[PDB]
Amino acid sequence: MERKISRIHLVSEPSITHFLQVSWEKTLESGFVITLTDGHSAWTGTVSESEISQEADDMAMEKGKYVGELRKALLSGAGPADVYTFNFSKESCYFFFEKNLKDVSFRLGSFNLEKVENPAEVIRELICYCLDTIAENQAKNEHL
Amino acid sequence: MEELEQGLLMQPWAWLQLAENSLLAKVFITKQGYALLVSDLQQVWHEQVDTSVVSQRAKELNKRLTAPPAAFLCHLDNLATFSCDCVADALILRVRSELSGLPFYWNFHCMLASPSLVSQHLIRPLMGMSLALQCQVRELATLLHMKDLEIQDYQESGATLIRDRLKTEPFEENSFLEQFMIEKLPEACSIGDGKPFVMNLQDLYMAVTTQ
Amino acid sequence: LDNLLRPLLATFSCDCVADALILRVRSELSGLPFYWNFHCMLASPSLVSQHLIRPLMGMSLALQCQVRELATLLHMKDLEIQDYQESGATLIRDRLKTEPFEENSFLEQFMIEKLPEACSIGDGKPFVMNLQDLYMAVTTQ
Lengths: 144, 211, 141
Prior knowledge:
The structure is cut from a larger assembly and holds one copy of chain A and two copies of chain B. Chain A is α+β, with helices and mostly antiparallel strands. Chain A has three helices and eight strands. In chain A, the strands form two sheets. A five-stranded antiparallel β-sheet of chain A has the order 1-2-3-4-8. Chain A has a three-stranded antiparallel β-sheet with strand order 5-6-7, with helices on one face. Chain B is α+β, with helices and mostly antiparallel strands. In chain B, about 50% of the residues lie in helices and about 25% in strands. In chain B, strands 1-2-3-4-7-6-5 form a seven-stranded antiparallel β-sheet. The interface of A and B includes residues 61, 69, 82, 108 and 110 of A. Chain B: It comes from Homo sapiens (Human).
């Protein structure tokens, strides 16, 4: 399995950086679990295979090219040209995200999240992984 | 939308490369909507659309790719892959574009234009252009005759030519038509794909419509 | 009907009923009165393209080629008067000196000064008198 933590901004909340965590089995195309947090609270949800097919068919694009847009938004894979935007009521837990061009923000999708019950604990786990992962790529670097 | 129609009358024609043929299109875009007239030189088709139809039809064609109507309209003003069907006489014109680094879709639902707009957007302008072009021919032919009266004054007293290749024959209009009709008319009157029209007549088109 | 219409192209009247035009003829065939009605539908988009749009467009192109060919003719006459004054070492009666032709300025003067009346559709009258020999030629072609 893979995971990828990514840093974002809600349009509801300019100065608060939020963290998206995505977790999936190598192809993001196969569906994923998703977590949002803001350092104070957390929320979670899920997306699936046929949904992503349908959602690319929904925009008339090739699947894999649309998965490209999802990698880039959700996985920080943003090319130099790409600006992405995040929207969420914490109350309804309705998420949606977008890309900004043409002097507009363009929606790229929507989720039902749920407010997570053990906020500080999925946070603890989240950042320990990060301390470890930095250290592994560091040790390869020293050798080179 | 009345101002959209008024802009349209006075817009020039563009030329569109389909895969299947070409089209001629005049379009007028604002933040308010658009009006479009299209032709394949056999038939003519019309659409007019406000921002209500824009955000509905764009939300259908482009499910999750949200914008204000005016930002879509702004991009169409830039003007991509064109295809079409006549289904009944909806010339449905299907446009694939790039915007935001995303593929985009618009379909124009173009009905057979009314005979009244065919008159106002083609026949009357195109007639008015032929009459105006003929008055230009008439004024170049007076100008050619005036330059001959001038040059004949030289031929009447002294004034030999130095460069043995500058000679003009005296201008005479009937024979200039006679040679044109055999040598030039075949090519020049050819409609082709309408690229000749859009390439050299749009200034006169814009002027005659505004007259 | 032919011998009545040929000189003219008796009395006529024109009546519209929905989309259809009726053209009525009162005349005399022998000393006796002759009556006819023409019953015309709206012409199809095929006919309007073939009889009007396409030929009228083909005429404007050919006329634009005429203007082009007359402009190169005009410039070739300007090289010729220059060759007389500039080097052919002579003058004129002065009362006939033309300006050097430039098609940009020719068009701008034309379109401020002459366009308002020149493109007048009017009664269609001047189109049938000035343009028909071109119309028949373009249609044949």
